[PDB]
């Protein structure tokens with residue numbers, strides 16, 4: 231009954247000749263609500279970054295977890311870093327993750 | 331971990347000057363699947379009746395229940411009776427319910 | 431206290447400019463506006479720092495414009511609203527851009543071509559079957575809210591004049607009766623689970639309430655038959 | 671044994687007639703055909719009683735036609751398939767119309783204007799964060815399958831060459847990347863939860879598999895870049 235987000239180690243992929251920086255935030259111990267635990271991210275310039283959620287999913291051990299990934303060029307890795315994830319409900323958050 | 335359907339007492343409503351026969355089937359103890367426990371009905375003439383499901387819903391006591399209602403004129407209550415509901419997975423079923 | 435928004439539910443016609451409001455918690459320096467649509471996470475819109483906007487990246491169309499003159503009250507307006515505006519706009523407040531956020535009820539918005547598509551819920555309650563009673567020694571009541579548009583409803587059970595939350599399990603969100611058609615009505619179901627000994631008591635009264643939010647007073651209605659305004663629809667049944 | 675259907679996944683272009691098959695359990699007198707669409711319950715179609723159809727009420731369009739000549743094998747064909755045919759057709763068998771039913775894997779069908787809309791999944795795996803490891807003493811891996819159409823995929827984890835099901839939690843159904851657009855790609859996620867002591871072992875190999883079902887061999891492809899055929903896409907990572 232206590233939500234717990236976590237920023238996973240970044241991954242590097244390719245799109246159109248451009249190196250792509252992809253990250254994801256995983257919130258845990260989320261109740262089984264009719265609503266959910268919204269997941270949004272924050273950058274370095276103070277701006278927020280639109281992401282893609284996968285919605286809460288009933289785990290095999292009788293729990294619920296919401297997921298959301300974020301994609302952005304490795305070029306701008308010197309402007310958004312560090313990266314922060316948020317969830318909840320008030321809401322909850324995690325520690326900044328130095329992209330660099 | 332053992333699905334259990336049940337035909338609830340019918341109800342009488344009004345649509346357009348016509349008395350409407352509305353019934354519903356409630357399946358219980360349904361697991362939390364990525365799929366679900368499909369609910370279909372059977373009539374008297376051997377034919378099946380298209381219904382409307384509400385999908386499995388996480389109960390507050392850590393369970394899942396799928397629902398589905400069926401509507402038909404009280405005129406044809408002398409052709410479809412008794413009524414039967416089905417669920418699962420093989421599949422499961424219930425006892426006939428004399429509409430009349 | 432804490433963060434409150436108004437209105438919570440607003441249905442409007444396309445081409446009709448609307449306005450929203452938010453009253454953050456007292457002593458909160460920052461203020462945020464978000465947009466949830468298609469189940470996606472809160473998409474940033476604008477940022478308010480002491481009655482001053484320092485960020486407007488999230489804003490797609492220039493039709494939107496929020497103002498926080500008082501410094502404690504903000505107001506987001508949307509001129510000539512469209513269908514892509516049909517979403518839930520949230521509001522957050524904090525001691526600053528470096529502190530946790532407090533969210534309010536939010537504002538569910540739904541725009542439509544014609545306001546004639548608005549309809550109240552068709553609430554009906556069913557009794558527990560003898561099979562379930564004799565097997566689990568427990569009874570479960572079912573409430574059904576159908577043919578209502580938009581999906582602006584609040585279902586709640588009321589046993590003996592008082593609302594109950596225990597044993598109450600309602601669907602996460604209303605389901606379109608016809609997903610195929612772009613414009614379709616919604617449905618909803620709920621389940622109240624009591625003891626078989628409780629349901630078998632004629633004295634006990636069970637009622638399923640469905641708070642529907644439709645058109646307000648300031649909205650003209652032509653159709654001679656009734657008028658889908660903000661109303662409630664319930665269904666009751668006595669124990670056996 | 672028991673009831674098997676073929677194909678399990680079939681993607682076709684509009685105007686292209688298709689054909690399905692079902693091999694019921696030996697000794698089963700009855701045979702049924704159903705249609706699941708929009709999440710709705712199995713909608714009856716036709717009925718087979720010993721190679722003989724005694725009911726055809728469920729059939730909407732005359733384009734559909736099933737035959738059971740052998741009496742043990744049925745075949746449902748759909749001439750000039752359309753978009754309203756995009757659904758999961760199930761098959762059931764029983765000792766008679768008065769006995770329980772046995773269902774097969776079913777046949778997921780998806781029709782499209784152009785077969786150029788078919789795309790393989792973009793599978794990628796992420797490692798557990800140090801925060802989750804030091805807190806719960808457990809590690810959770812994440813797999814992501816994106817940009818694939820239609821939603822014909824089968825995700826599974828493979829630890830040390832062998833597939834695992836324990837601690838495996840995958841999404842119920844693929845989610846459209848853009849729900850607004852009628853034609854949109856799908857996404858998918860999964861979660862494998864192991865012990866922190868297990869993930870912290872370089873020897874252990876973790877792989878996320880995503881079985882994608884696209885176009886068969888008998889389908890012509892013009893686009894010079896690759897060809898979205900029935901293939902698998904995986905992503906792996908070693909423990910730390």
Ligand SMILES: *[C@@H]1O[C@H](CO)[C@@H](O)[C@H](O)[C@H]1NC(C)=O
Pocket residue numbers: 275308309
């Ligand atoms: C910060 O934000 C601005 C405005 O979007 C952007 O142009 C810049 O690249 C970012 N990085 C810096 C220089 O702070």
Ligand SMILES: *[C@@H]1O[C@H](CO)[C@@H](O)[C@H](O)[C@H]1NC(C)=O
Pocket residue numbers: 375408409
């Ligand atoms: C049985 O089915 C037929 C065909 O749909 C229908 O016309 C009739 O009303 C039903 N009742 C009887 C007479 O068995």
